[PDB]
Amino acid sequence: EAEVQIDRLITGRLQSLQTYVTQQLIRAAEIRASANLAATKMSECVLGQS
Amino acid sequence: KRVDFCGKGYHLMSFPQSAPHGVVFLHVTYVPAQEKNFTTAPAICHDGK
């Protein structure tokens, strides 16, 4: 029966880890978009006149 | 007219080329050099004007 209990625990923990990784990926994409906008603003408004 | 969008410096034109899964731009820029020092003033007074 120990194989059964270990299998249940392993699959649950793996599912939780997968969910966390997916959330991290979404957040990374959003942060990339925001930083691209910030870099554009810094490059165009500081070094020149808009 | 926006600075640092196509190339580095003032912009003249560009030419596109194809790629296996994308596009490649060739930008033609303009860069000055060989400077001097001189001396400057903001305005010139003459006859009170």
Side-chain angles (χ1 to χ4, degrees), chain A residues 1-42:
Chain A
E1 69 275 17
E3 292 95 9
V4 187
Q5 286 96 24
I6 302 319
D7 179 270
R8 300 173 80 91
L9 276 189
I10 280 176
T11 185
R13 290 182 179 180
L14 188 142
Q15 161 79 346
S16 80
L17 189 55
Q18 281 291 145
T19 300
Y20 164 66
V21 173
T22 292
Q23 300 292 339
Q24 275 315 102
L25 264 293
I26 314 298
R27 210 149 295 136
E30 196 277 335
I31 286 297
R32 171 61 175 173
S34 185
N36 189 306
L37 161 68
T40 295
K41 268 165 79 79
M42 192 285 318

Side-chain angles (χ1 to χ4, degrees), chain B:
Chain B
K1 298 282 165 50
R2 62 181 292 166
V3 192
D4 194 318
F5 194 34
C6 278
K8 203 204 171 274
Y10 310 130
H11 188 266
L12 281 189
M13 63 194 108
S14 292
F15 318 113
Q17 303 291 277
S18 189
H21 277 323
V23 70
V24 171
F25 290 98
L26 314 179
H27 303 304
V28 178
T29 56
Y30 167 96
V31 166
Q34 200 160 357
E35 302 86 318
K36 285 201 69 181
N37 262 350
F38 301 112
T39 305
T40 182
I44 286 177
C45 293
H46 168 247
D47 276 338
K49 324 193 298 282

